[PDB]
């Protein structure tokens, strides 16, 4: 049975800590960006070479793309439309990689030599991603770019490790966060929040670096938390950060969940307790990311949190109501029909 109240309590706390509230991001602007990002991406993924080197089921690509654009537009609120579009493509590539069962070994045998010689990579994924990377990198300074490149490389190894469906050896306490950081894209996400057009990598080096280090853990743990509901009974999903704590540390799913909430809540508090008295433009980007990121989760049908809403909408409980109050907040600005932006389907663009 799902820890419905415990979950609710933790969710409301996280929200208060981060100061979850209303933004000046109008539903009309969201639709403007949503359609803009989706429109550049669908046309990209619809090109021939893309269509033939990126092995993904058409229906899942469409879904993945819509999910990713949703997350970007809603979290990288302050960057430009082009930046959202370009980050949408890169994060859709990374999402798509989890669909491969194919062992990377054979295609990674000459990874370095091909890289150093300027020859196209053997693994089709790497071929598309490195070819398109400049489009994403042009929006950043050398420091931030370096973070993206590294994180994406970590991501690749993360996916490789996961093909083994390995939650860790009982007793290997370091395995869980090791794996979560590899497939997390923490430094990618974190360093992509600062476009050299609205920020100065050098003048803000300390804050940017710090953000990356704190955002890496907030971003991944918040996702682990919000996802805890859909993954609860997913017998297919076997190696989540929480399921690994269970196996690696040898504790109950409950205790594992306790560790996650403790880390998440704390991560939140320190985030706030560090950026408030910091360059406003910076705290704004950070604060907006947190809120949008949370909105997206509550709104995307992928996380099915509306099921929880529908099951506690009527209760005189303090949390139960605080949750709904929050939920309806995100709903009012985030519940947009895909028909208003995500069109036409990638498949149709590719067939033309």
From Swiss-Prot:
Q: Record's family? A: Belongs to the trichodiene synthase family.
Q: Which gene encodes it?
A: TRI5
Its Enzyme Commission number? Answer: 4.2.3.6
Recorded hits in InterPro entries, A to Z, give:
Isoprenoid_synthase_dom_sf (IPR008949), TRI5_ascomyc (IPR010458), Trichodiene_synth (IPR024652)
Instruction: List ligand-binding residues for Mg(2+) 1.
Output: 98, 162
Q: How is the cofactor bound?
A: Some of the cofactor binding sites show unusual localization within the protein.
Give the consequence of mutating residue 303 to T.
Increases the KM for farnesyl diphosphate by about 80-fold, reduces the kcat by about 120-fold, and leads to the conversion of farneyl diphosphate to an approximately equal mixture of trichodiene and an unidentified sesquiterpene hydrocarbon
- What is catalysed by this protein? (2E,6E)-farnesyl diphosphate = trichodiene + diphosphate
Any Pfam family matching the protein: TRI5
Per the UniProt annotation, how does pH influence activity?
Answer: Optimum pH is 6.75-7.75.
What protein name applies here?
Trichodiene synthase
Q: What is the effect of changing residue 99 to E?
A: Leads to an increased KM for Mg(2+), a reduction in kcat, as well as to the production of anomalous sesquiterpene products in addition to trichodiene when incubated with farnesyl diphosphate
Q: What is the documented function of this protein?
A: Trichodiene synthase; part of the core gene cluster that mediates the biosynthesis of trichothecenes, a very large family of chemically related bicyclic sesquiterpene compounds acting as mycotoxins, including T2-toxin. The biosynthesis of trichothecenes begins with the cyclization of farnesyl diphosphate to trichodiene and is catalyzed by the trichodiene synthase TRI5. Trichodiene undergoes a series of oxygenations catalyzed by the cytochrome P450 monooxygenase TRI4.
For the ligand (Mg(2+) 2), the binding residues are 223, 227, 231
